[PDB]
Write a protein that binds this DNA or RNA. Structure first.
Ligand SMILES: [Zn+2]
Ligand SMILES: [Zn+2]
Ligand SMILES: [Zn+2]
Ligand SMILES: [Zn+2]
Ligand SMILES: [Zn+2]
Ligand SMILES: [Zn+2]
Ligand SMILES: [Zn+2]
Ligand SMILES: [Zn+2]
Lengths: 149, 151, 150, 148
DNA sequence: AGAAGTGTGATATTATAACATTTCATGACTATG
DNA sequence: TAGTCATGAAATGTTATAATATCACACTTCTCA
């Protein structure tokens, strides 16, 4: 039902803006929401084919592009996968991604200090950065407890 | 004054000798070919370069080489792209790094940052997250492309 | 003994006479092509291929098709963007006329050497160097006519 | 010479009580100004300088119209479209000779092929509604280029 | 033996180019009549 | 008083390939008993 609430919320946001949250996009969103965290496009496509048997890569990639242009999903560059954002209605934001290499779970946190260090490092050199990519690989708490036995 | 490109290669050879791992002609050629780049490079571009010498070369060659070089820490993979760059900091003990990437000219700078590792560990510590490795990659413009914008 | 077996055997023999690799994947794709009434799209064929190779993706079927095209086991139907099995692997490269029913979708392949000759002559009048002909007819087949008559 | 055929088109689109919009006319104009085959999306790119709000349905509808009248032919084996040789003649059947190098397309008549196709269809129970006849190779020019 | 390396063809994975249609809301001609 | 025709705008469907990466086998080479 958190999924329901999430979808409703997304519908509300997309209703606010002049943008169309289609059944397809909504479906993809639902699927990704039900997923714990990260997922590749093609596994997601395989999931999508349950409800839309004719679905092909452009379908899911289009849905993702849409959900990416809006603030609903993030790409995970170091795994070629995608995940939901933990907070929707906010604008283009830099967030730090903690990715479990075991379960695929992703925790999204703020890291102003990092942005700042990079902001200064870009300035002590001649760099004008537009965007930071901050992805951490490791193990989440559960998977940590599991890997210790 | 930072370490020269050639010193890194010599250092690579001797380090591989110290570890009893084989820095073969191929892996060496790949290493130098990468070292000549003014920034990151893709596997197939590198493959194309490698062909002028070894035309019989295929992707497995390049990817094997890259896997080896990555394992020995001479090369970094740039994850936001899908490219590979020489490490200009492997003469010291293994390190954390942030890659600064120009979207246009494509050049990249590896710059150390303990202050990032610490914050990441701190953020990872509050949650129960056993951090292992960091990917820090910055996109924007370097102060060559910047002075082309100002015209 | 069955047509499919015989066919795959022929193919296996030809792909041996020629020093070429008829892999399980290619064999499976060909097997599937042989079991079709007529023409099939690359993606329908992919969907069929996924029943045996669940990981299969578009480059898979397109590679298999490119191979089967190179070796002359399948023809591409350009006007419908589809593929059919060749009726006779025995012949070398050949100019084939395709009769395509816009109702049932079935496709019949016919020989027409005359056409090759005419096109060659016509191309030879000008300075055109002919490589391949594309000859496809659209209409209704006998069955669809019988049906439509009522 | 473009204006000539443009006018002729209207003249013929008078006799046949169908409406040739500036849309379809513009498409036909662009098709004419092109000295060879063209894809729908390139044509769409060209149609946009005139009508920047143009989109694929626009050009496709246009092409469907221009196709159904006899002004343009579809080249099935290249998924492209070409202007007719001359559309003063009755609804003919084109045999398209296509250069795989330069992309030049030469429309010719091959009534013999059609005849044969009809006989073959006739010996079957096949009701032949339309034939597609296309050749791929090298135009004379490209041959002479490759000769060197 | 045995572990590591290479050559080669084919396959697997991720993403997009390229080509064509659907939908549905909106306006613009027209056949009664 | 509607009827078809034409368009406008977004999304979707459909076909095919680009771009990235690995597998699987065979042959080998150089080392280890
Ligand atoms: Zn977020
Ligand atoms: Zn975990
Ligand atoms: Zn480094
Ligand atoms: Zn730059
Ligand atoms: Zn045949
Ligand atoms: Zn039929
Ligand atoms: Zn014509
Ligand atoms: Zn030519």
């Amino acid at each position: 039902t958190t999924t329901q609430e999430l979808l409703a919320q997304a519908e509300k946001i997309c209703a606010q803006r002049n943008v169309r949250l289609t059944p397809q996009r909504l479906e993809v969103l639902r699927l990704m929401s039900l997923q714990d965290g990260a997922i590749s496009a093609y596994d997601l496509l395989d999931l999508l084919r349950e409800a839309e048997p004719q679905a092909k890569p452009p379908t899911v990639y289009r849905a993702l592009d849409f959900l990416l242009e809006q603030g609903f999903v993030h790409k995970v560059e170091s795994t070629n996968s995608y995940v939901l954002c933990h907070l929707f209605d906010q604008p283009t934001h830099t967030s730090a991604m903690f990715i479990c290499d075991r379960c695929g779970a992703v925790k999204e946190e703020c890291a102003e200090g990092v942005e700042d260090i990079m902001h200064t490092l870009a300035a002590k050199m001649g760099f004008a950065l537009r965007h930071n990519v901050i992805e951490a690989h490791g193990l989440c708490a559960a998977c940590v407890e599991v890997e210790a036995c």
